[PDB]
Amino acid sequence: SGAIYVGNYRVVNRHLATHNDWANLVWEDSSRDLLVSSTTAQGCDTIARCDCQTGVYYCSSRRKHYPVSFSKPSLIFVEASEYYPARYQSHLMLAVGHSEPGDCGGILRCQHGVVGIVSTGGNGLVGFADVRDLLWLDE
Numbered sequence: 846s847g848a849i850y851v852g853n854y855r856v857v858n859r860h861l862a863t864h865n866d867w868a869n870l871v872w873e874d875s876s877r878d879l880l881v882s883s884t885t886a887q888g889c890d891t892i893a894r895c896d897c898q899t900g901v902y903y904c905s906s907r908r909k910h911y912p913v914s915f916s917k918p919s920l921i922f923v924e925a926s927e928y929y930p931a932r933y934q935s936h937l938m939l940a941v942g943h944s945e946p947g948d949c950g951g952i953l954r955c956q957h958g959v960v961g962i963v964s965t966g967g968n969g970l971v972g973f974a975d976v977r978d979l980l981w982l983d984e
């Protein structure tokens with residue numbers, strides 16, 4: 846679990862969005878596993894606007910942060926799950942690191958701000974949904 850709180854927006858994994866997220870929907874994209882909902886309170890986070898390929902992510906299944914080198918956002922095949930059929934997930938970045946299903950939502954940050962959130966994983970890999978291209982989050 847986990848979310849990014851920026852301005853009057855809450856960014857979550859689309860597969861973990863609540864009834865309230867859907868009732869206050871701003872934008873969602875099944876191909877990216879992202880959903881953004883509106884909030885009444887002003888958020889705590891800054892979004893990176895950069896091309897970093899190194900950063901640190903929070904891994905809830907270890908209660909620890911780990912440094913990672915990750916690939917640029919791209920279209921990556923993701924196996925079928927209870928949430929989605931087998932498909933290509935876009936804007937996904939992979940890295941070697943521990944993750945388990947419940948780790949989705951963990952933030953990936955570089956020196957410039959929030960890069961994205963944990964969205965996929967398996968066998969010593971971890972995938973992050975990028976949010977750096979969503980320029981409207983800052984306005």
Ligand SMILES: CSc1ccncc1CC(=O)N1CCC[C@H](C(N)=O)C1
Nearest residue numbers: 878926944945946949964965966967
């Ligand atoms: C950190 S998720 C994870 C980690 C390790 N083994 C498995 C997983 C689960 C996982 O990859 N997905 C299930 C939930 C929806 C995901 C998606 N974006 O399509 C895919």
Ligand SMILES: [Zn+2]
Nearest residue numbers: 895897955957
């Ligand atoms: Zn950066």
